[PDB]
Each structure stands twice: as structure tokens, then as C-alpha cells.
């Protein structure tokens, strides 16, 4: 049946898929060693008895998130032979992992891709968790994004980015290699769910009460995402949302697909119990400015599609009628050409928690996933951010060292100077 | 050549040691984790 | 060529814990 | 695999490494015949860093201790934790460098690196792959500098794409043995600042007084100012040896702090560092361990950064800690020190994070920082160079082993280009 | 008692049972990592591998009795 | 199975209640010590929580296990006396069981039982039905925050049933 | 929280900063070592406000403990809740100043300040947000009166918004100690009073005045002297750490006792002060503890309140008590003492109810007062200054370290400035 291959590439997309991983096994009941103590089979390949392996391929140039994954509690259910590693870490620089040091290691990911591309009837999408921050995330997934483009052309591609954030910046060379990365995500991607990291520091202070988290914590928060985002695949429910009709309701050019993301009801246990989570209210708190897991005001731009995946136990009508709330606000603004806004989807079972997480339990959750012009003024931030460094041409005789003829900063600069272009230019 | 065991351990300089442990509970360990 | 004992990561380590311990 | 070999660069170099093989061992939890325990397998998984398999369960160093007189190897060897390296690293020179850059980098340089670049041939190509050298030397001394970095010519030409990290003492504003302390310095920079890629600082005086007012030790030897060093030595490579949140390398730490590739001289420090009455009553969080460690006053490095820019910072934190408040806690210090920074680089600064602290501690930092500051070391080396310059003296012992006149003005010169560079970069 | 009241500033008190440094009380008894710290329960990191009983050309575990 | 025998658990003034007395209950054991200063500072907040919870309701809903890590008999009786809630004798082996079991110690840790990871002093930790681990409430651990940590707790879906 | 930073200058700054640790310590049940004892809520629910925890399960006061010479708190040290300090608090002097107003504000007060600057800043930033500032000096000596007002004008400019509240002793008339009064009492005060917020007098022969008439005590040693300053010196702060049924911050006795920004000095008295012999004949009643408020052999200050009017005025009630009680005897002597109060203010007065009490005592008052009686004090150290002044005495020990003699003289205009001011609104 149905299956969505992850690749997973960069210590952040690695850690990610530690939790994505995590939260999969405990949805649909299923141990460390592959046993069970249908719906296995869109994240599982059931080989033996009971040997339930997962459809992941771990990606990085160094020795050290991996290996440590491999000595850790999946040892046995992450199969150790698609656990790809290297030896030289790429080091935050786009001019390494997308060339010499990382050739190597493409055509073993490849071949491990193709293998698990071609072991299951009728594969549905690949779910990339990368991290446009730095070295082996950018780099290896830009080459690596580069070739399924033209070993899979029919092929839908999600992707999952974390973003350099505003005022949070762990490297000074994001800001060359996030604009050195858009070649990779204009025209070589589908689906551009947007994530970063300060954004996802707000959105557990002041709704889990946790002042001091860490990045297990934030890849709680994506898990939830993206296990939202594939319940309508796996599990059964009224106004199923497919990955082929996703991006169906958010895309409308091809050059726009860059879209945001926001869950609702992430309250730990104590102040959970104290508001009745209603549909109006999920999904109010789902459109709320400050529930976006990016530093985007959803006011300076106007939306031009949403996708809210509603799960657990939701009716298909109060939910159009918390739709019909949001429309008649006039904060929640939307632009001309849609009289309609809104696809819905709804599963049946409830949002799961993680034993010993930060969460809480609820039958109900709104990760809606929306494509509006205020993205525009992320990658715009990011302009201003480049061009300061690029002027008098500092941390570039590495980029010029192992590849980067003097030009690819220049195209790059035009492609992502032309992205934002293209957004003001839709909506007027 | 002065075989005072303080002033060795001044001289190969066990004194930093002392001074850059910490005098109370440093390792904390318990896992957030259930079954 | 350097080999290390089989309880460090260094080439196939996977392959060399089960069947010689060390 | 991922191997640093390490260069016991001078006497100055070797007591400066003894307690920093002290400090990896005892990290590592490594017997000193070459044998472990300590509980916790993680410091076997990555071993090979600097480590070899002895083929009978030992392991040694792959460390290639270097001298030109034998009295001090006499001396590491009688020391705790000399016998862990194998008899046939060291390498001996007989006659003794005269404190003199000619003595070593041209007369008995030639009869012992052919020696030196066949101990380290047989160490590097031991492994498949590599990232670097690290060496520890001195730049007052003739063995430590004149030799020193003649070896750092003779590694980078046949390693182009390999790491340099060299650990480095600098002459004293205040205080200065071996007399001839400007023409071992100057000279040895000259090859310093192409032959190395990451160059990093230290000042045996700003190490005096670290002891003096924020360690608070009465009488400092220098055992204590070596092992002092040596708690940023390790944490400067913890994060190759060991997991971490923020995995970092020294590549990582080259690709993110030098700007320009002529100006690579950082600032190395160190946190927490109390006294025995202070230990108690201090806080150890994030927020609190940050401020003690962008100051002057715990700095390894005498070059007061208030008069200066940082280029580029950096922190390797060590420890489980929560990194929320790490790094919302470095914009924190960049906002509030704006002017400290500069200003066109929006976060100046890395954070890294280690996850097994150095042991007897919850948490700790190393902080690499590329600051304009450094330049009042080198125009105090450079008009103190040209003191003795302009009137000839002391240089007749340096002519009749290879001088001429061209390589002096060139040698201030080289300085006179770096200083113009720092000043210009404001 | 063993000198933890007054803030204990030594971790020597851990050296003295492992004297030998070989007594296989000091070996691999705990490892300290965040992925401990957040993704581990009781016991699912130290288990061995069940490969097969008659060796290595054994692809499973089979028989003449099936 | 049974975690408390039939003459371990005391509570104030001295009865002993057996394990039949303590469902539908959310039962915390509290490893704590009289010389601590984090005990001390955390012993005022643990009293006006369970005042608080224990007082403000139509059941009784959480409930509390003293565990001294304290020195001797007379230290016992001086903590006692301020906590209303229950405890174990300490030298009973029950408190030695407990702390291995649920990993709670002091620092003396390699001359008997030479394990790893330590989970220090203080700890409340909320049990269940056949001793198992529920959630742990983190005054010192990876999240380190103190004196507030008690709200953390989760009765409703915690119960000694 | 709302944080205070503590700042102790002089020698008695020291030794009244010394008592008053040491009785806000038992208030909030703090062990000599560090640790707690006394297991009830409210001690612990704000001890933020004056305390810090140091990872030890511990509390450190937040004071800076200061002057120029090391002989004051080597005593203190080693002194009874002595130990509870930050070791590194302390920023010691080594000259000391010669009871100078020159030497404290010029001369060596400027290469000590930059310590005291560096320590303070850590110990205000260092928490999430900062309420303000509590100085503790005198205006007679030479350190708390020649540096302190150097920092009280410092940090004003780096915290402009923050509140700042200063306890400052007075010299004495029928005794003068430290024979050059006036100079150190006027060339502090002229700075004084533009830099600090609001600011407390206290008078040595007053305190004096209340042991003997009031409190009967045979013997009143400075420790049970400085006792008596600080049971009003933790009265202000009362209901910051500790709840009540009507607030009062510190900027709420501010707001409403300081009608125009230039007047601030405030007269300070404490009730009950019972005899040992009276304690157990007195009722303990909100009546009577409004008139031991209203008295002049109450007051702190030597400046006897009828002899002039009271310009604003404000108690801060403790313990538990009925409010109408308060709020009757509130009125009624407005209503009786018409004549010693002012006529253009309906309700000269405020009241606040702190909910916890003091130690043992039922019920207390500490109460502010800003009259305008305390203008006899003005011209008293007006003209002590004019008659010394006029034939030039004592100006060597002044003018020889740097001052221009206009300096003295805008010193006196000023403060008479303030007089004539204090007599415009009688
Ligand atoms: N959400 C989340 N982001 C992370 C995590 N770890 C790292 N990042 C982000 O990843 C960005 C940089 O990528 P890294 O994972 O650190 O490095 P990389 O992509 O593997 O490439 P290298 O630089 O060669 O190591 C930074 O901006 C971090 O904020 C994580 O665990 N969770
Ligand atoms: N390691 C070490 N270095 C020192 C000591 N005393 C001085 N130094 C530094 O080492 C330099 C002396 O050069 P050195 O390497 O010792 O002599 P060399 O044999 O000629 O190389 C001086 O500039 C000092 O800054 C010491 O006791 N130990
Ligand atoms: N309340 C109080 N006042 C004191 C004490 N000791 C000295 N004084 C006063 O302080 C004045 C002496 O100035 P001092 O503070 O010692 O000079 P400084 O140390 O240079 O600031 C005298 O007039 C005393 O009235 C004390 O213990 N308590
Ligand atoms: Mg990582």
C-alpha cells in the first residue's frame, strides 16, 4: 500500500527524525525490535516475523549524530545498513557538502533510496527533514535533492526546513548558505513547510511553561507537525487529505510553495484540563499572529490558502463553522481571488502523547499548514542579512577553495531576489 | 632539592585541580523517558 | 592501517561485536 | 577516521603537553601503564582521536614529543604519565639551542627534522583520513619557535588540506626572560601567519594573575599555569572526542571565525574558575557563567577587549544543559555589549553545545574569540623589535648562521601589513 | 560518615573500591548522553543480537523440524 | 505484587496503615534529607502544595512517602515532626530497596552498588500499581527548576489503582 | 523578581549593612551557614528581592560591601551571619582615606570605583529585571561619605529609570567626631540630592536620644545602636518580600511623599520601643502606636517636627490588624494637629498594612516623614561651614588634591538653595 520514504540529512534533520521516529512507534503500537507486542505500512515494512522496519535513510558527513543513534535504544529497529555516514563533517559550509567532500556518500544514499523506492507498490512521497542552518544539511541536500529530480520527475516532495531565525543564529555562515540553499528550494521542491528555531522557543514558554527547553523538546513539536500532516495516509477518517491533493489546496504557482505551520493545542496537563478545547477555539489558536512556528507576521501579508488538518474526534460541520469564524474576522485577512480558503481534513484518532513529554492528551489538534505573501518577508530579511557580509567578501575563500565559482553568491542572490518579487507581484 | 610533599603538589599543580572541581552535586542523571 | 578494540567506532564495528567479543 | 596527531613543540611546548596528556588521559579514564576503567564505555567509542592500539590493550599517545636538548625529556619521562608514550616518539637533539632562531631553524634544524617528519610520517599516514595537527610551542625561545615552525613549514607543504592549530605562547609586556625575546617572536610569525591555520594565544603573565585574582592562589608556580591552559585544551577538542547537541570540529571552528585569511590570532579562555571560599557560593547556570566569561579579568589572553572589536566570537559550553538560554543569552551579550561587536555581522558568534562536561563539573565553556584587541600585542612586539633593530645590537649571533639583512625589514614589515589590517578592520 | 555534609570538594571518594582499576565495578556501567537523557526507557539499549543457532550461513532460525 | 509491607508504612502519630489504605490515591514517594539545603528550601512549598491539593477538594487526591537520607535516628525524629504526610522507618531495608530501585542516592555509591546514572537529592517521584515509574517531577534534574516543579504533577491520570 | 542591590560605604555602612542582613536573615529563617530552617510558606514565596540562590541549595545576600581601608569587615567576617556574604563582594581599600571628602571622591576613589562598578553591574543584570538601589554611609566620614556619593552619581547614569533610596547618618551637634564635619556634610549633600531618589537622615545624638529616654537602655553600643536603624530599615521594604492587604513599593512611598523633585530627605522614626521594664504595662494597640509614631523623641533625625510643618507624611503598619483602626487614627491627627501639618495637602498622609509582623512583636510601625522642621539642620551645618570657611581651615588637606575653591562655593549655594526652598513652604 501507501509509504513515504524520509530522508533525513544534517544533525537536525538526524535529531528530528530521532523524535518523528519516536512518535510513529507509539502511535501505532510497535517495539524497538520491530514486534508488535495494516496501517503499519506507511512508515513500515513488515519483513519476517514481525520484523517492522522503518522507511528512513539517515544522512550526515560526520561520524557523530549517527553513530550515536546506532549505540543508542534503536540499535535493532533502525536497521544498521541504511544509517549512511561519512567521515569528514561538511562544516557549516554549502561549498563542501555540495561538492568534494560529499560525492562520496551521494551515490550510497542514492543506491539505499532506490532501494527503498522500489520494495513497496505505488511509493506516495519523500518527506525531506533538512536543515538549511549550515554544512551536510544544505550541502548534501541540495546534490541530493538535485538527482531525485531527475531519477523521480513525477515525484510530490515535502520538505521540512529549519530556517535561520531572526535574532537566534548558532553559526555566523548561515546567512551565505540559507540564500546558497534556495536553488535548491525554488524550483526542486514541492511542498516548503517553513520551521525555525526561536519560534518554536515561544511556542513552548508561554504554552508548556517550559522557560529553560532544549532541541528534544522542539522536535516534539515537529513530530506533532508532520504526525498530523501524514494521519489522513495512515489512519482512517471522514474528508481524507491525501500528499497528492496536499499541495493541491496550497500551491497556486509554481514558483510560490513556500507555505508555514502552526499545532493548537500544546498546553501541558495542569492548564489543559482548565479550557475546554473547542473546534472555535483550536482553530483561533491555530490563526493566532503569535502560534507560528516562524517569525512571520501573519498581518503584513495576506493568505492565500489554508490547509487545516483537524484530527481526532472532530465532527465535519462545527468544523465549518469555525471556518466560517475565522473568515468573518477581520484580522484573519485573505486576498481576492479565493471565495474559499479552506481545505479540511479530519481523522478519527486522537492526537497521541509521548510518555514522559511535554503534552498533554486531547482528541482534537489543528496543524494547519498555510501558503500566505507574509512569508515573503522572511526570505526579504534574509536579503538585507546577505548582503552586509557579501559586500567587502568575507568567510568566502573557503566557498571559493572547494568549489563556487564567483558568480553562484551573485545567481543566488538574483534567485532569491526574484522569489520575494514574484510574492508582492501575486497579491495586489 | 626540597622534598616537601606540598610544594610537589604545588609544582605539578594538583592546587588547579582542586579549585576547578565543583564541592557539591555536579552529575545529574535521571531519564525523562517512560515506557 | 590502524585496528582499535571492537567497543570503538572505527570502519565495520557493527560486524565486528557479535561474532568476536572484545 | 577522525585523528589529531600532536607535536610536542619546545620545552616550553612539552610541560605545556604533559598536562595535557595529563588532562585527555584522565578525561579518558586511562591507567598511565595505558590501560581503562571509569564507568562509562563513551570515552572508548571515540578513543582514536588521540590514541593508539599498542597491540596488547595498551594505548599510547600520538603525540611526537621534540626537543633540542634532553634534559627536560629526561624529566617528562620521570614525571606521572610519561611512560604512556612509546621510547620511539621522542626525539633528542644533543648540542641545545642558544634561546637563537638561527641555532634552530637553520643550523641543527637540519640534522633533526628529517628525523622529526619521519616520526610523524609514520603517525598520520597510520589512518585513512585526517583532519589536522595541533602543536604546543612558545614564541620566546629558539627550540620552540626557530625549529618549531620550521616544522610547520615542512607539514603544510605536504599536507595542503590538513588543519593547523597551534597553541602558542607570546613574550610579556611586563616581564621578560631569555633576553632576546623580539627577534625569536618576530620570526617565527613570519611563517606563522601562512604555514598555520588557526593560531591561538597565550601570555604566561596573563596566566600569572588569573592565578592571582579570580583563582585566588598565593604563590604561583607554573604546574598551575599549566594545567590552567589545559582545561581549554581540552575543551577546545571535547566536542571531536565526545557527543554533543552542537557538534563541532576544528574545522567547524575555522570555518566560523576567521573573516579574511591572513588574520587568524584568537583569544582562548576558560570557565568557572573560583577560589575554594568562592566555590560555594557562586550560581552555575548559563546566564550567570556567560558574564564571567566575556571579561578581561579571566581572559588567557592580555589584550584588554574593551579598547577592541570582536570579529567573531565563540563558546564550546560542556555539560547537559538546556540550550535556550544559551543562545538567546548571546544575543543577549550582543546587544548589550553593541559596541564591542562589530557591526557588520549580524551574531558575531557561535554556541556550541558538549555534552559530557570536563570531570569534577556539571558545565563549562572554552571561548575562541577573534578580536581586533590583539593588535596592541603586536605593535608592542613590533616597536620593541625595532628598539634593538635600529641600533644593530644583539644580531651578530644571529648573521654568522644565515641572516641577511632582507628577511628582518621583511619580518617587520609582515607586521606592519597585519597591524594595518586590524586597525583598518574598525 | 563518608564527608559529604560540608560540600564535598573531592571526587576521589570514588577510588578507592577500584584500586586494581580492573574489578569490573569500573567497567561500562552507565552512559550519559541526551539521547538518554530524552529517549530511553528501562532496559532497550543493552541487549544482545539473536543472529542464528547454526552459524553464519544461517539466514534465521530454522530446521529440520519444519 | 506488594511494595509495602504490613509493618512498614507509618504515617503521623505513630499507626501503621497497611498498602489496602492508599487507593485511589496519587502516591509520591520524597527522598529527601534533613541536613539538605534543597530539602529545606523545597519544604515549605511541598507543605502549602499538599495543604493546598489535600485541603481544597471532595477527595483526598495526592498523598506523600517520606524517605530520609539523613544520618541517624534523632535527625529522623526532627524531620518527622514537621511533615504530616507518611514515611518509612529508615532503618527499615525498605529505604535501601527504594533507593536502588528507583535510583535516589548520595554520593556513596561505589563501595556497595557500583552502577551509573544517579538522580540526586531531592527527589519526589510519583509511583503506582506495581511500583513502576510514572513521571518525575524535576527539582534537580535536566530541567533543574526548583520550588515549582510540584506543579508538574499530574493526578488525574496518575492513581494507585 | 524585584530585586534590591545592597551598597555598603564607610565603616559604619559596613557595621549597620552588618545588622541589617542579620536581621532580615532570621526574618526569612536563614541558618548561619546558609541553608533554611523553619519550614512555613511566606519566608520562601519572595526571597529573591534579597537573596540569590548559589546552586547549593543556598541563599547570598546581594551587597556590596565597600571602603578604603581592610580593617572593617576583616571583623565582620569573622563576625556572627558574617560568613553569609559574597567572599568576593567585599572590594577591599588598601590607603584608606584620612576621613577625607578629597581623597574619597578624587584620588584613590577613582581606580577602586571601577572594581565597585565592575561588581554591581553583575549582581543587577544578573537577574531578569531590577527594582533598584539601597545605599547604607555616612555623610561625615571619609569613605562612605567621599566615594559612596561618587557611586550613588555613577550608577544613576547607567539606571536613570531605577529607584534609588539611600540611609544616610548625619553628623551631630553637641557631638562631632571626625573634627572636619561640615566639609564632608555639605560637598556630599549638594551632589547628593540631584543624584539619589529619595533619601533617609539619620542622626547619631537622636538614636542616642531614644536609647536613654525611650528604650531606658544603660549602655547603648553601636551593635545595639545600628539595631535600631535597621528594624526601620526593613520596614520600607516590607510589603516588596512579604504580602499585606495594601501595598507599598518603594516607588509608592516616592511617588506620594516627593510633591517637587529637589526635597527628599525624609525623617525615619520605629514603633513600639518599649523599656524592659514597660513591655509588659504597655497595650499594644493601633491608637497608641500612631502617637509613638507622631513623637519627637521617636524621630531618627534630631530635627524636632513641630518646630515646623509636615509637609507629607506615610507609616507602613505590620502585622495583623483591622484597617479602619489604622485608617481612624490616620485622620484624627490630621484633625488635632492641625498646626503641624500643612494646609494645601487634604490627607498629608499615607497608610499601608503589611500582613506579616516584625520578630515577637504583635503589631509595628516604621514611618517617613517629609517635614520641612528639618531645615534647623541645614543652617546648623550651614553656618559650621561658613565659620570654618571664612578663614580658610582645613582647605590644604582639600584644595591639594585637585579642587578649584568655586567648588565649595556652588557646594553652597546650592544647600542653602534647598533652605530657602524648605522656608517658601512653611
Ligand atoms: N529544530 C532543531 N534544529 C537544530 C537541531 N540541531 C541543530 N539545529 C539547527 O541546525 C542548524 C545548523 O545545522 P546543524 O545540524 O547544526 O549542522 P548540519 O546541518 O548537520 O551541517 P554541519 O554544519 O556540517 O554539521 C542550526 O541553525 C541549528 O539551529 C535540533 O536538534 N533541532
Ligand atoms: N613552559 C614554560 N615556559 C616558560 C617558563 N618560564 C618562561 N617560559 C616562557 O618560555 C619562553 C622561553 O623560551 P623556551 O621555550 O623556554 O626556551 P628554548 O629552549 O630556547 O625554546 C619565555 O618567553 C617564557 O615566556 C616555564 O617555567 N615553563
Ligand atoms: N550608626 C553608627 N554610626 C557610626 C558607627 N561607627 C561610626 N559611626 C559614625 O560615623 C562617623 C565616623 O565616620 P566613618 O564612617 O567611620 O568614616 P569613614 O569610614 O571614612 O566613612 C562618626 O561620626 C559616627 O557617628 C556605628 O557603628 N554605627
Ligand atoms: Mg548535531
Known amino acids: 500500500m501507501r509509504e513515504v520514504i524520509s530522508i533525513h540529512v544534517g544533525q537536525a534533520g538526524i535529531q528530528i527524525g530521532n523524535a518523528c521516529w519516536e512518535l510513529f512507534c507509539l502511535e501505532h503500537g510497535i517495539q524497538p525490535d520491530g514486534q508488535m507486542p495494516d496501517a503499519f505500512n506507511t512508515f513500515f515494512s513488515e519483513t519476517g516475523a514481525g520484523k517492522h522496519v522503518p522507511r528512513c535513510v539517515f544522512l550526515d558527513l560526520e561520524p557523530t549524530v549517527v553513530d550515536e543513534v546506532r549505540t543508542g535504544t534503536y540499535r535493532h529497529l533502525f536497521h544498521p545498513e541504511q544509517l549512511i555516514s561519512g567521515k569528514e563533517d561538511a562544516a557549516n559550509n554549502f561549498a563542501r557538502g555540495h561538492y568534494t567532500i560529499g560525492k562520496e556518500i551521494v551515490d550510497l544514499s542514492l543506491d539505499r533510496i532506490r532501494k527503498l523506492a522500489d520494495n513497496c507498490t505505488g511509493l506516495q512521497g519523500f518527506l525531506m527533514f533538512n536543515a538549511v542552518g549550515g554544512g551536510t544539511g544544505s550541502g548534501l541536500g541540495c546534490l541530493l535533492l538535485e538527482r531525485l529530480s531527475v531519477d523521480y520527475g513525477k515525484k510530490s516532495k515535502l520538505n521540512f526546513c529549519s530556517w535561520p531565525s531572526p535574532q537566534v543564529s548558532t553559526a555566523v555562515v548561515e546567512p551565505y548558505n540559507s540564500v546558497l540553499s534556495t536553488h535548491s528550494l525554488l524550483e526542486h521542491t514541492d511542498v516548503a513547510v517553513m520551521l525555525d528555531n526561536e519560534a518554536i522557543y515561544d511556542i513552548c514558554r508561554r504554552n508548556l511553561d517550559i522557560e529553560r527547553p532544549t532541541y528534544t523538546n522542539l522536535n516534539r513539536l515537529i513530530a506533532q507537525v508532520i504526525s498530523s500532516l501524514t494521519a489522513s495516509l495512515r489512519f482512517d477518517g471522514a474528508l481524507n487529505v491525501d500528499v497528492t491533493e496536499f499541495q493541491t489546496n496550497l500551491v497556486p504557482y509554481p514558483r510560490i510553495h513556500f507555505m508555514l505551520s502552526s499545532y493548537a493545542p500544546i498546553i501541558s496537563a495542569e492548564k489543559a484540563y482548565h479550557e475546554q478545547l473547542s473546534v472555535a477555539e483550536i482553530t483561533n489558536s491555530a490563526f493566532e499572529p503569535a502560534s507560528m512556528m516562524a517569525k512571520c507576521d501573519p498581518r503584513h501579508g495576506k493568505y492565500m490558502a489554508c490547509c487545516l488538518m483537524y484530527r481526532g474526534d472532530v465532527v465535519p460541520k462545527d468544523v465549518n463553522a469555525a471556518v466560517a469564524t475565522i473568515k468573518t474576522k477581520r484580522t484573519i485577512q485573505f486576498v481576492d481571488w479565493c471565495p474559499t480558503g479552506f481545505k479540511c481534513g479530519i481523522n478519527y484518532q486522537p492526537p497521541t502523547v509521548v510518555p514522559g513529554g511535554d503534552l498533554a492528551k486531547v482528541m482534537r489538534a489543528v496543524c494547519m499548514i498555510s501558503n500566505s505573501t507574509a512569508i515573503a518577508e522572511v526570505f526579504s530579511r534574509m536579503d538585507h542579512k546577505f548582503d552586509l557580509m557579501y559586500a567587502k567578501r568575507a568567510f568566502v575563500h573557503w566557498y571559493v577553495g572547494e568549489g563556487m565559482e564567483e558568480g553562484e553568491f551573485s545567481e543566488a542572490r538574483e534567485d532569491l531576489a526574484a522569489l520575494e518579487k514574484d510574492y508582492e507581484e501575486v497579491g495586489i | ?35 | ?22 | ?426 | ?66 | ?161
Open chain 5, 1 to 66: 560518615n563518608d564527608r559529604l555534609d560540608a560540600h564535598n570538594d573531592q571526587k576521589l571518594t570514588s577510588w578507592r573500591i577500584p584500586h586494581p582499576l580492573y574489578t569490573e565495578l569500573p567497567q561500562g556501567s552507565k552512559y550519559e548522553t541526551h539521547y538518554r537523557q530524552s529517549y530511553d526507557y528501562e532496559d532497550w539499549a543493552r541487549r544482545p543480537v539473536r543472529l542464528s543457532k547454526y552459524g553464519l550461513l544461517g539466514h534465521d532460525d530454522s530446521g529440520a523440524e519444519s
Open chain 2, 1 to 35: 632539592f626540597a622534598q616537601d610533599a606540598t610544594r610537589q603538589r604545588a609544582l605539578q599543580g594538583h592546587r588547579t585541580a582542586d579549585l576547578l572541581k565543583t564541592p557539591f552535586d555536579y552529575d545529574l542523571f535521571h531519564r525523562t523517558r517512560l515506557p
Open chain 3, 1 to 22: 592501517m590502524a585496528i582499535h578494540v571492537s567497543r570503538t567506532h572505527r570502519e565495520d564495528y557493527i560486524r565486528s561485536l557479535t561474532p568476536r567479543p572484545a
Open chain 6, 1 to 161: 505484587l506488594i511494595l509495602f509491607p504490613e509493618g512498614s508504612l507509618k504515617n503521623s502519630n505513630n499507626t501503621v496503615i497497611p498498602q489496602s489504605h492508599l487507593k485511589g490515591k496519587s502516591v509520591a514517594l520524597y527522598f529527601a534529607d534533613g541536613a539538605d539545603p534543597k530539602c529545606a528550601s523545597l519544604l515549605p512549598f511541598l507543605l502549602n502544595y499538599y495543604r493546598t491539593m489535600n485541603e481544597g477538594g471532595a477527595n483526598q487526591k495526592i498523598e506523600i512517602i517520606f524517605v530520609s537520607l539523613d544520618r541517624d535516628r534523632e535527625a529522623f525524629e526532627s524531620h518527622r515532626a514537621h511533615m504530616p504526610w507518611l514515611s518509612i522507618d529508615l532503618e527499615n531495608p525498605l529505604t535501601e530497596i527504594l533507593k536502588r530501585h528507583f535510583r535516589v542516592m548520595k554520593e556513596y555509591e561505589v563501595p556497595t552498588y557500583g552502577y551509573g546514572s544517579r538522580t540526586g537529592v531531592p527527589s519526589v517521584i510519583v509511583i503506582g500499581s506495581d511500583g513502576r515509574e510514572a513521571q518525575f517531577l524535576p527539582i534537580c534534574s535536566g530541567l533543574e527548576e526548583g520550588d515549582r516543579a510540584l506543579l508538574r504533577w499530574d493526578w488525574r491520570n496518575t492513581k494507585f489503582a
Open chain 4, 1 to 426: 577516521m577522525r585523528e589529531i596527531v600532536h607535536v610536542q613543540g619546545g620545552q616550553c611546548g612539552n610541560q605545556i603537553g604533559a598536562k595535557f596528556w595529563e588532562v585527555i588521559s584522565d578525561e579518558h579514564g586511562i591507567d598511565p601503564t595505558g590501560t581503562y576503567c571509569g564507568d562509562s564505555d563513551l570515552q572508548l567509542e571515540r578513543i582514536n582521536v588521540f590514541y593508539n592500539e599498542a597491540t596488547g590493550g595498551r594505548f599510547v599517545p600520538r603525540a611526537i614529543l621534540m626537543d633540542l636538548e634532553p634534559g627536560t625529556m629526561d624529566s617528562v619521562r620521570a614525571g606521572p604519565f610519561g611512560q604512556l608514550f612509546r621510547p620511539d616518539n621522542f626525539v633528542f637533539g644533543q648540542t641545545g639551542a642558544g634561546n637563537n632562531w638561527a641555532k634552530g631553524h637553520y643550523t641543527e634544524g637540519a640534522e633533526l627534522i628529517d628525523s622529526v617528519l619521519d616520526v610523524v610520517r609514520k603517525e598520520a599516514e597510520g589512518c585513512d583520513c585526517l583532519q589536522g595537527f595541533q602543536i604546543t610551542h612558545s614564541l620566546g625561545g629558539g627550540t620552540g619557535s626557530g625549529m618549531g615552525t620550521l616544522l610547520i613549514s615542512k607539514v603544510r607543504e605536504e599536507y595542503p588540506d590538513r588543519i593547523m592549530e597551534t597553541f602558542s605562547v607570546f613574550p610579556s609586556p611586563k616581564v621578560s626572560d631569555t633576553v632576546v625575546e623580539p627577534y625569536n617572536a618576530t620570526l617565527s610569525v613570519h611563517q606563522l601567519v601562512e604555514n598555520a591555520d588557526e593560531v591561538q594565544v597565550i601570555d604566561n603573565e596573563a596566566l600569572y594573575d588569573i592565578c592571582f585574582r579570580t583563582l585566588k592562589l598565593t604563590t604561583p608556580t607554573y604546574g598551575d599555569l599549566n594545567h590552567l591552559v589545559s582545561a581549554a585544551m581540552s575543551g577546545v577538542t571535547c566536542c571531536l572526542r565526545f557527543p554533543g547537541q552542537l557538534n563541532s570540529d576544528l574545522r567547524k571552528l575555522a570555518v566560523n571565525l576567521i573573516p579574511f585569511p591572513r588574520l587568524h590570532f584568537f583569544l582562548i579562555g576558560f570557565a568557572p574558575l573560583t577560589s575554594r571560599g568562592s566555590q560555594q557560593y557562586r550560581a552555575l547556570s548559563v546566564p550567570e557563567l556567560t558574564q564571567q566569561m566575556f571579561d578581561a579579568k579571566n581572559m588567557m589572553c592580555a589584550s584588554d577587549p574593551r579598547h577592541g572589536r570582536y570579529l567573531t566570537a565563540s563558546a564550546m559550553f560542556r555539560g547537559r544543559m538546556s540550550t535556550k538560554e544559551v543562545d538567546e543569552q548571546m544575543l543577549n551579550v550582543q546587544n548589550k555589549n553593541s559596541s564591542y561587536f562589530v557591526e557588520w555581522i549580524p551574531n558575531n558568534m557561535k554556541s556550541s553545545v558538549c555534552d559530557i562536561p570536563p570531570k569534577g563539573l556539571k558545565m563549562s565553556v572554552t571561548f575562541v574569540g577573534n578580536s581586533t584587541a590583539i593588535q596592541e600585542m603586536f605593535k608592542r612586539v613590533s616597536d620593541q623589535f625595532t628598539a634593538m633593530f635600529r641600533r644593530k645590537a644583539f644580531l651578530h649571533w644571529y648573521t654568522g648562521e644565515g641572516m641577511d639583512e632582507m628577511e628582518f625589514t621583511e619580518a617587520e614589515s609582515n607586521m606592519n601589513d597585519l597591524v594595518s589590517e586590524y586597525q583598518q578592520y574598525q
